Design an enzyme around this catalytic site. Sequence first.
Site, PDB file in Angstrom:
ATOM      1  N   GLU A 188       0.844  -1.202   0.000  1.00 53.36           N
ATOM      2  CA  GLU A 188       0.000   0.000   0.000  1.00 53.36           C
ATOM      3  C   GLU A 188       0.874   1.246   0.000  1.00 53.36           C
ATOM      4  OE1 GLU A 188      -2.527   1.849   0.131  1.00 53.36           O
ATOM      5  OE2 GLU A 188      -4.363   0.907   0.890  1.00 53.36           O
ATOM      6  N   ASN A 202      -5.890   5.815   7.278  1.00 54.05           N
ATOM      7  CA  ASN A 202      -5.602   4.943   6.148  1.00 54.05           C
ATOM      8  C   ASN A 202      -4.843   5.596   4.993  1.00 54.05           C
ATOM      9  OD1 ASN A 202      -6.468   3.495   3.465  1.00 54.05           O
ATOM     10  ND2 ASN A 202      -6.758   1.989   5.157  1.00 54.05           N
ATOM     11  N   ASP A 206     -10.234   2.227  -3.319  1.00 51.56           N
ATOM     12  CA  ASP A 206      -9.187   2.180  -2.314  1.00 51.56           C
ATOM     13  C   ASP A 206      -8.366   3.454  -2.566  1.00 51.56           C
ATOM     14  OD1 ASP A 206      -7.086   1.463  -0.607  1.00 51.56           O
ATOM     15  OD2 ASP A 206      -7.180  -0.675  -1.095  1.00 51.56           O
ATOM     16  N   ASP A 228      -5.576   9.135  -7.219  1.00 49.87           N
ATOM     17  CA  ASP A 228      -4.720  10.292  -7.499  1.00 49.87           C
ATOM     18  C   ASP A 228      -5.205  10.916  -8.782  1.00 49.87           C
ATOM     19  OD1 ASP A 228      -2.497  10.977  -5.665  1.00 49.87           O
ATOM     20  OD2 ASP A 228      -1.561   9.102  -6.218  1.00 49.87           O
ATOM     21  N   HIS A 287      -3.046  -6.572  -3.914  1.00 50.63           N
ATOM     22  CA  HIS A 287      -3.115  -7.584  -2.866  1.00 50.63           C
ATOM     23  C   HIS A 287      -3.423  -8.994  -3.311  1.00 50.63           C
ATOM     24  CE1 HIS A 287      -4.214  -4.020   0.005  1.00 50.63           C
ATOM     25  NE2 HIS A 287      -2.940  -4.014  -0.345  1.00 50.63           N
TER      26      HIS A 287
HETATM   27 CA   LIG Z   1      -0.869   7.966  -4.487  1.00 50.93          CA
HETATM   28 CA   LIG Z   2      -6.026   2.514   1.325  1.00 52.16          CA
END
Ligand SMILES: [Ca+2]
Ligand SMILES: [Ca+2]
Length: 312
Positions: free
Chosen positions: A19, A118, A227, A230, A285
């Site tokens: 992440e 997060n 999730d 950008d 993931h």
């Molecule tokens: Ca980013």
């Molecule tokens: Ca995230």
Amino acid sequence: IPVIEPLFTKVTEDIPGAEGPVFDKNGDFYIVAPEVEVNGKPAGEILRIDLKTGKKTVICKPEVNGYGGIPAGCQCDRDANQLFVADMRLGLLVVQTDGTFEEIAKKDSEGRRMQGCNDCAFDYEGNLWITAPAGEVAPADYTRSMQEKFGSIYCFTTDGQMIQVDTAFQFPDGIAVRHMNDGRPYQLIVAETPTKKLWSYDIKGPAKIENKKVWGHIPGTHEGGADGMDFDEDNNLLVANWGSSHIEVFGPDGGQPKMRIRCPFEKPSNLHFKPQTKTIFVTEHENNAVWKFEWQRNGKKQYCETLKFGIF
Ligand SMILES: [Ca+2]
Ligand SMILES: [Ca+2]
């Protein structure tokens, strides 16, 4: 919706819960491994990746009073080469390239216990907008707002206040700031994962948001949803849609995606442009790995790419 299928090139492997991809001011590349555990307890890591070899170095394995972190998202500062890291157990950290770190807040500006965070996004004014889908930070027992609406949004400001700016989300996750061409911040976008929505607000000033609106719709009924996100340099918003095998591309007016990008894996988690290029690095993931691909144009500059002392 048109779908493109760019070539994804492997960058690095075996990063649990890969992440928070981010580039620092020297162009070095980092990722976080929030899901590393030792004896079933959190022991998340922040890693530097050598882009030439794919080799990984753990620079920080944050723990506060024996409570290990779940570092999950990152932004690089402008005035100093240091990373601000959203951590699901520890809140907001500031991490130096030497691996030392500090924990920013045990409580917010109103004296409420801080929640685990997060992802985060700096605006061009240097204010840091942060999602907080976890409950209270360590040493509180770990909880998350996937079932119940207790996720919050904060703005950590230039004058050092950690201000809660909204509450009652069901797992707020990715976040981004849209700016006017003159650099003024004016819209905040926040992903609410399981509800398949992106929410927008008008940014009226530091830590001041109004006019909450359902801004975008994330495709699919899979488990997962938006999730990380950008903007590209034309203000299209790219959003990892975890569980869908795609990154969605929204135009500046939101609504439904205008294009999708097929990934060779089901669970893109987050993404980041490399400065001065069209290259997007993507964490995922399914394989717990990092990849990169070429987008149609350069990324919108991050705060760390801007100058405090510009003229123009
Ligand atoms: Ca980013
Ligand atoms: Ca995230």
